[PDB]
Ligand SMILES: Nc1ncnc2c1ncn2[C@@H]1O[C@H](COP(=O)([O-])OC[C@@H](N)Cc2ccc(O)cc2)[C@@H](O)[C@H]1O
């Protein structure tokens with residue numbers, strides 16, 4: 197099964213409670229990083245399986261900032277720096293989706309991939325109208341009882357109004373896309389369980405409609421941007437890896453079928469000195485983020501050493 | 502002293518922690534009532550004393566509804582019915598201010614009286630911008646700890662997001678007028694202690710500036726609108742009054758100096774059958790709300806009976 201393969205690979209951590217699925221990426225920087233990569237893959241796996249996916253840029257929401265999993269209040273971001281980053285991200289996601297569509301074809305009939313931005317619909321949204329329209333459908337108890345929200349709420353200083361209100365936007369986003377694109381599935385890291393929850397409860401209060409969430413593991417400075425992190429630098433992060441991990445990361449960052457992976461490892465023991473599973477993971481990934489060129493301008497770089 | 506006379510009269514309940522002072526009136530109906538009258542007098546007393554006052558219509562805030570002192574959630578109001586009422590109120594306050602400026606002159610140099618509406622500045626306010634601009638200055642603990650807010654919060658059903666967010670707007674209003682009109686005093690009934698609090702703390706977080714609040718007693722169906730409640734009907738509310746009260750209501754709803762009042766009462770005992778203090782209170786008030794005509798078309802009405 198589709199979900200089977202992904203839960204099995206270790207990509208689809210959990211789920212609650214032709215389709216359309218989405219995941220958001222807050223443009224709090226101009227570059228995506230290796231962690232973002234994992235959520236994005238989740239989309240790529242659903243896309244290959246034939247589904248339509250939407251990778252959303254948080255032009256609006258990054259002005260505020262996600263409180264989720266954070267113990268400290270963020271440095272409010274200049275409304276313009278966030279506008280820039282949002283345009284960098286869009287570019288970055290169309291870029292990735294680009295490599296993925298040529299360098300990893302499988303003859304399967306694929307689904308669409310679309311980059312949206314929530315600023316598009318927030319720029320037409322006036323405070324009291326929003327509040328008047330929806331505010332009456334968010335029970336305060338509900339919002340107050342997210343586990344995502346305790347680190348900041350229960351903090352010594354407390355949580356700004358903004359931080360708290362953040363979840364409400366994300367909840368609304370899910371509602372919006374669901375309305376306009378019939379999208380009934382949201383996906384993100386585990387840190388996003390709370391927010392997604394708000395979404396499906398909210399949608400459920402309004403329409404008896406059942407939508408869904410899916411999470412993926414969180415992995416534990418590494419940029420998808422050639423400018424920030426060279427294709428070579430990036431290769432090194434995946435090559436300098438412990439053997440106990442290269443197992444999971446293969447199942448994590450690559451499309452190699454599980455059997456192909458299996459062999460790679462069983463083979464690795466007959467040749468531990470080879471760093472073979474790393475030389476594979478590193479290749480697969482750098483191919484996806486930086487294209488064939490990037491792989492080459494990294495293969496080459498190390499080799500001479 | 503000015504505050505002395507008002508605290509003494511029983512009009513200036515409390516205060517915390519040429520000037521400009523304001524009080525808001527939510528257009529949840531097209532008519533003001535006798536209770537509103539008290540808060541408005543508070544303004545009139547400050548205005549006679551020479552100060553500039555602003556009677557604010559809550560065009561925006563009445564769409565939500567004030568949670569303060571309420572045990573139950575309000576029936577969400579049609580955004581259009583609220584627009585109509587807001588235009589009725591503006592008319593009603595310019596009307597009262599009218600009678601007050603002819604039928605109650607005292608040769609003193611008076612201060613300005615201005616009717617504003619918050620919808621004016623909320624209609625230009627976009628959700629994320631507001632949240633982005635200010636949301637970070639409202640500690641959630643603060644907002645969560647108003648006594649105004651417990652009846653609804655601690656309720657079995659809980660409080661909508663809207664109800665809770667209400668205080669935030671009122672807090673912002675005070676900040677707005679203070680910015681634009683250097684207004685540094687807000688006044689309302691006692692039920693409004695909480696909200697006003699939010700205002701001066703918020704202003705204080707932003708500017709070390711000290712602004713202030715003043716409250717007035719709450720009195721315990723009676724419309725300032727000739728259409729709803731005839732000038733005669735209204736006279737009867739003030740005439741059908743217990744002697745233990747006519748004392749306070751004179752000090753409450755009239756401008757008669759305290760000595761003049763004193764006599765009226767000491768006189769009343771020599772003639773209890775006269776209902777003299779009531780025939781005075783009733784006259785004073787009906788004169789202010791319905792003008793000389795109204796007094797007459799009420800004096801006349803009863804007399805023939
Ligand atoms: N190191 C990592 N390892 C694994 N996963 C990671 C890692 N870092 C980030 N992620 C995941 O990838 C996404 C990154 O977006 P974000 O700006 O960090 O989350 C903010 C998001 N709430 C923005 C949003 C906006 C609008 C919306 O509708 C939905 C969501 C999120 O789904 C997040 O859970």
Ligand SMILES: Nc1ncnc2c1ncn2[C@@H]1O[C@H](COP(=O)([O-])OC[C@@H](N)Cc2ccc(O)cc2)[C@@H](O)[C@H]1O
Nearest residue numbers: 525526527536537539540559671674689690718719720
């Ligand atoms: N029976 C009564 N006796 C004495 N006083 C009474 C009585 N009834 C009402 N009041 C007072 O008169 C005013 C009426 O406003 P309101 O819509 O009832 O409260 C809502 C308010 N938040 C409106 C507002 C809107 C915007 C804003 O910025 C400030 C305020 C308030 O100051 C209220 O406390």
